[PDB]
């Protein structure tokens, strides 16, 4: 379907978009006490894999799944909350602020770099077709 460079750069754009979405969702839920049901929000992470591809030497980026972070959930002593345990510590998400801003900046700069790569390749693509005519 897609040309190889198109597929690689578009996969890069989609992967960076997914990472930015995960960072934004984490930054939104930084202060959430309970989730859909009653369990604390867990910071999400996105794992980048290289599309194996038949070529292997050349391949884009895919995202296998969004994993839930395994870090000590923040404990805040609020015994009056219905979600407090026997000891009374309500669970707050493990979303760090600085890491998510750094992730947003890095995802944006990778997105823009891949955009520039596509823009650079395009002119050569359109100029290839003038070879025959």
């Amino acid at each position: 379907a897609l040309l190889n460079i198109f597929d690689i750069a578009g996969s890069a754009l989609a992967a960076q978009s997914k990472r930015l979405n995960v960072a934004a969702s984490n930054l939104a839920n930084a202060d959430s006490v309970t989730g859909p049901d009653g369990q604390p929000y867990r910071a999400k992470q996105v794992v980048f894999q290289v599309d194996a591809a038949p070529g292997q030497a050349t391949g884009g980026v895919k995202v296998a799944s969004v994993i839930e972070s395994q870090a000590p959930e923040k404990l805040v002593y609020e015994p009056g909350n219905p979600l407090a345990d026997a000891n009374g510590y309500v669970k707050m998400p493990n979303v760090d602020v600085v890491g998510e801003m750094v992730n947003t900046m890095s995802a944006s700069r990778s997105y823009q770099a891949n955009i520039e790569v596509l823009n650079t390749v395009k002119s050569m693509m359109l100029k290839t077709l003038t070879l025959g005519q």
């Binding site: 989609a14 859909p36 895919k62 995202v63």
Partner: peptide, 21 residues
């Protein structure tokens, strides 16, 4: 399967409830 593939079936509706039903 892979995000961005082609299937003959529409995706299920995207519901997000606020409370457990």
């Amino acid at each position: 399967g892979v995000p961005g593939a082609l299937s003959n079936q529409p995706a299920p509706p995207n519901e997000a409830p606020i409370a457990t039903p």
